[PDB]
Write a protein that binds this ligand. Sequence first.
Ligand SMILES: CO[C@@H]1O[C@H](CO)[C@H](O)[C@H](NC(=O)c2ccc(C)cc2)[C@@H]1OC(=O)c1ccc(C)cc1
Ligand SMILES: [Cl-]
Length: 137
Amino acid sequence: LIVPYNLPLPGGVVPRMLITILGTVKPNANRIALDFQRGNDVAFHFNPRFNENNRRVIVCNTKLDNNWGREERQSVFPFESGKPFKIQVLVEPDHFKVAVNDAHLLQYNHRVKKLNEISKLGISGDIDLTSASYTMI
Ligand SMILES: CO[C@@H]1O[C@H](CO)[C@H](O)[C@H](NC(=O)c2ccc(C)cc2)[C@@H]1OC(=O)c1ccc(C)cc1
Ligand SMILES: [Cl-]
């Protein structure tokens, strides 16, 4: 698939929706981003950074009216330059739950509460994208 890729989420997200993203990280990757969008707002930004001051970190945040909020940072970093990955995002009633390569990574409490209005997922960054899909579990 071509990156950046936009995956419509018809009628928005709902609990029990599972989004699965398969791809490969490019060699010498700098960043990956998943952006769950509510119009111009970003309800959930998931941003692995491969070199922030010589550290690897995942930054999560929300953008409202063009302003970024308080960052949530995770130092557990399961991505590897050059290697295939699987990201799964499970929507639960009170948070997005993220697993990478079948291991739980993090949860992100819902800041944007109109879940039905979060109707697009943007996938961008230094990856080759193989598949992006959703199902109900
Ligand atoms: C305070 O910096 C911001 O933090 C926000 C989260 O709080 C977003 O991540 C913004 N990123 C973005 O808008 C953004 C755009 C495109 C992609 C692919 C990812 C993130 C932006 O990050 C950056 O400017 C930035 C610069 C270099 C690296 C390596 C990572 C982040
Ligand atoms: Cl809201």
